């Protein structure tokens with residue numbers, strides 16, 4: 168395990184996701200409100216899935232070698248397995264907060280699936296120049312998602328409770344900033360142009376992942392917006 | 399890319415799915431009705447997914463070699479990845495049109511999953527005679543789906559709005575004819591008996607795919623059946 | 630096929646799932662009640678999926694070799710493909726019976742996904758001692774599911790119809806006993822410590838699978854709890 172310099176960040180990531188999972192699990196024990204239960208379920212599952220995939224990367228299972236540029240390049244494929252399930256759960260948290268219509272939710276989840284799926288294909292593609300074609304398609308799917316979060320959701324939040332409108336606005340802003348960093352790190356890291364070494368890349372993704380999951384969850388689950396308006 | 403004679407049909411397929419995706423995306427921009435949004439979301443996602451998988455076939459990612467009959471046989475596995483997601487979306491379009499009950503929808507999607515999954519296993523099976531066992535099981539799942547579309551849905555459409563009944567009937571008929579061709583092409587093509595060469599097989603699937611997705615979508619999204627009855 | 634001593638149990642399993650599938654399919658033909666249709670759909674799909682995966686194991690497709698302990702160890706990976714889809718369907722049968730809230734259903738299905746997914750990783754892991762780390766995480770996800778079935782569902786059933794409360798209690802008890810055997814068989818069988826040989830392991834899983842699917846389904850589909858209260 169320690170044979171890879173990036174192991175320290177995989178281990179820290181595993182620990183922080185594990186701790187985040189346990190914290191949300193305990194916190195949600197005292198919850199009976201049916202609406203709050205939905206948000207706790209979604210939000211606890213996110214770091215639990217990430218915990219398993221960080222562990223698989225730490226132990227070496229979630230790593231494969233991909234030939235491109237005349238080299239055997241270490242590619243952590245387990246990231247995409249994580250993201251396939253956790254990024255639509257994160258979007259679902261946002262969509263339920265603002266009572267999004269079903270068509271909009273399906274558009275978001277579908278675009279998200281395309282985003283992660285094409286990122287996976289790009290990560291595993293052996294023809295170097297083609298990796299960036301997949302990156303571009305994935306990034307276009309991301310831009311669609313960000314567009315919807317701003318010009319379909321923000322003006323939906325404003326007709327809702329003030330506490331859900333303010334909580335949505337904060338989580339929207341956190342999401343757009345954090346999620347936009349992922350394609351940049353991929354592009355300059357070992358999957359793309361290879362300018363930033365894998366150990367630093369792994370650190371960067373770990374900070375983004377913990378912030379986008381445990382950070383996000385801490386903000387959401389401390390808000391009164393997750394509860395039905397009750398006396 | 400041009401090293402494979404079937405590349406021209408993969409390229410045309412990619413282009414037509416891409417163009418179809420953009421057309422539906424633009425067309426649905428001016429839509430606020432919650433019901434119509436569902437149909438636009440579902441129907442736009444279908445060629446978008448197909449676009450990505452056609453591209454993966456064009457670039458060579460979605461192709462593998464399978465030993466059977468003492469030969470290395472080129473198998474485009476990306477078709478099944480496409481179909482796994484797009485065929486239940488197509489069925490969902492039909493089921494929502496007639497306000498199908500939840501049990502019926504689950505039966506359809508489940509049978510569809512079995513249909514595509516067993517087709518994939520058959521496509522990748524190395525014992526030649528066993529490929530046709532999987533083809534038979536998949537075809538039985540197809541026949542179940544077609545049965546339900548006729549003797550569970552058609553008489554559901556007739557108690558609904560005339561515009562939804564007439565639109566459903568047309569899309570049902572398009573679906574049954576087009577979908578029934580797929581097992582025949584598989585059986586006589588490079589996956590099955592090998593009587594029709596891969597380049598012609600690829601052409602045939604491209605015509606079926608564009609018709610079943612973009613053709614289907616053009617009929618559906620031009621109907622007033624996708625809108626709630628409103629003043 | 631007969632080259633593997635466990636083939637007889639794979640063949641019997643295939644037959645019993647096939648027969649169970651046909652029986653439930655015929656039985657549900659005379660059903661119009663929308664609630665009952667849901668239970669028939671879910672419950673018929675379960676042995677149908679299991680039939681396909683038992684067949685893939687019989688024909689040899691669903692088997693791979695995994696190096697650990699200095700040996701090539703036969704691992705039937707198709708079990709996890711089965712279980713990935715059938716165990717959440719089984720939980721859905723239980724959850725719908727007691728009209729579980731959406732948050733609880735998502736927690737169950739999510740924990741179940743983690744349970745099966747980590748079992749799959751453990752089954753395919755090449756470092757022997759690490760296989761048991763994945764077994765432990767999977768078992769913890771199982772224990773969560775069993776906890777919810779007892780201390781979240783049982784007291785939900787009691788405020789419902791007596792026929793649904795009594796049917797739920799029986800199916801809950803069947804589920805907890807049968808499902809708890811699976812991690813034990815894995816641990817002592819060819820995936821784990823290797824004390825029980827593969828042919829006996831295969832027998833054990835076949836008895837558990839038929840009981841947990843066809844047995845379970847026979848109890849559920851003969852109950853009046855699956856019908857809406859109607860005059």
Ligand SMILES: CC(C)CCC[C@@H](C)CCC[C@@H](C)CCC[C@@H](C)CCOC[C@@H](CO)OCC[C@H](C)CCC[C@H](C)CCC[C@H](C)CCCC(C)C
Nearest residue numbers: 276277280281284285287288291447450462475478479483
């Ligand atoms: C509604 C939304 C969910 C829409 C989803 C959007 C989605 C369509 C976007 C594209 C997804 C698609 C790229 C998934 C591809 C998975 C694939 C990378 C798995 C690895 O297999 C690739 C090659 C080795 O590189 O296998 C070597 C050759 C092997 C023989 C491969 C044969 C097995 C195939 C992988 C079977 C395909 C199954 C499905 C792709 C399962 C989807 C997995 C998940 C990653 C989407």
Ligand SMILES: CC(C)CCC[C@@H](C)CCC[C@@H](C)CCC[C@@H](C)CCOC[C@@H](CO)OCC[C@H](C)CCC[C@H](C)CCC[C@H](C)CCCC(C)C
Nearest residue numbers: 507508511512515516518519522678681693706709710714
């Ligand atoms: C409700 C509905 C959805 C019901 C669904 C119906 C469904 C049950 C029908 C059968 C689906 C099942 C056949 C999927 C099999 C996928 C498999 C072909 C992927 C390729 O792996 C096959 C061999 C190489 O040929 O791998 C070589 C050996 C490797 C070590 C394989 C180990 C990895 C396994 C593939 C893990 C299994 C994961 C699940 C099958 C994911 C499902 C993928 C999708 C195609 C259904």
Ligand SMILES: CC(C)CCC[C@@H](C)CCC[C@@H](C)CCC[C@@H](C)CCOC[C@@H](CO)OCC[C@H](C)CCC[C@H](C)CCC[C@H](C)CCCC(C)C
Nearest residue numbers: 216219231244247248252738739742743746747749750753
């Ligand atoms: C809401 C709930 C559903 C939550 C779900 C919980 C879930 C997160 C729990 C963990 C699931 C995760 C372990 C699935 C891993 C599948 C993996 C074993 C498939 C086989 O690939 C493993 C190695 C060979 O051993 O591939 C060799 C290297 C290859 C290059 C691998 C590259 C292809 C990757 C497999 C692509 C990943 C796609 C997704 C994992 C699809 C999920 C399949 C299913 C088994 C969950």
Ligand SMILES: *C/C=C(C)/C=C/C=C(C)/C=C/C1=C(C)CCCC1(C)C
Nearest residue numbers: 286302305306309346349350353379
């Ligand atoms: C918890 C993990 C999260 C929130 C991950 C988010 C990841 C993305 C938004 C990834 C986006 C990518 C692209 C837009 C193109 C390049 C490849 C990706 C997959 C890194």
Ligand SMILES: *C/C=C(C)/C=C/C=C(C)/C=C/C1=C(C)CCCC1(C)C
Nearest residue numbers: 517533536537540577580581584610
């Ligand atoms: C957009 C793509 C569509 C509508 C594809 C439909 C495909 C089928 C109905 C495929 C059916 C098959 C069988 C019935 C058995 C042989 C294998 C298949 C998968 C080709």
Ligand SMILES: *C/C=C(C)/C=C/C=C(C)/C=C/C1=C(C)CCCC1(C)C
Nearest residue numbers: 748764767768771808811812815841
């Ligand atoms: C129809 C099949 C059923 C009901 C299978 C149930 C399987 C399980 C509950 C498996 C549990 C496992 C663990 C808890 C850890 C070890 C690995 C598994 C996957 C066997």
Ligand SMILES: CCCCCCCCCCCCCCC
Nearest residue numbers: 348351352355362363364367371
């Ligand atoms: C969105 C953030 C992307 C920028 C990442 C900056 C990383 C700077 C680290 C120094 C680069 C290491 C190069 C020498 C090894």
Ligand SMILES: CCCCCCCCCCCCCCC
Nearest residue numbers: 579582583586593594595598602
């Ligand atoms: C459902 C349509 C299946 C029939 C396809 C007919 C294809 C005819 C093309 C000629 C066959 C090529 C054989 C000589 C290369």
Ligand SMILES: CCCCCCCCCCCCCCC
Nearest residue numbers: 810813814817824825826829833
């Ligand atoms: C939950 C049941 C697990 C116990 C399984 C008992 C199997 C006993 C069979 C005898 C073991 C075979 C060892 C000699 C080959």
Ligand SMILES: CCCCCCCCCCCCCC
Nearest residue numbers: 251252255256259272273280
């Ligand atoms: C490819 C995996 C996509 C599914 C991820 C799980 C999250 C799905 C959330 C469903 C949202 C509800 C839509 C109506």
Ligand SMILES: CCCCCCCCCCCCCC
Nearest residue numbers: 482483486487490503504511
């Ligand atoms: C194996 C992939 C199956 C899922 C495909 C996505 C479409 C699912 C549509 C869900 C229909 C709603 C059922 C209640």
Ligand SMILES: CCCCCCCCCCCCCC
Nearest residue numbers: 713714717718721734735742
């Ligand atoms: C990884 C596969 C998980 C999906 C299995 C299919 C069963 C899903 C049942 C959905 C229950 C409804 C939740 C709201």
Ligand SMILES: CCCCCCCCCCCCC
Nearest residue numbers: 306310313314317347350351
């Ligand atoms: C186009 C929608 C406006 C809100 C999205 C902001 C786009 C940020 C760009 C992210 C950088 C990705 C490379």
Ligand SMILES: CCCCCCCCCCCCC
Nearest residue numbers: 537541544545548578581582
């Ligand atoms: C049995 C249901 C009647 C409607 C379905 C028509 C079946 C068409 C056969 C398709 C050919 C597949 C090989």
Ligand SMILES: CCCCCCCCCCCCC
Nearest residue numbers: 768772775776779809812813
């Ligand atoms: C902790 C919840 C109480 C009900 C679950 C009973 C646990 C049975 C243990 C199963 C054995 C697995 C190794």
Ligand SMILES: CCCCCCCCCCC
Nearest residue numbers: 295296297299300303304
């Ligand atoms: C070796 C790099 C070749 C450049 C490929 C860039 C493709 C980016 C596509 C953006 C439309």
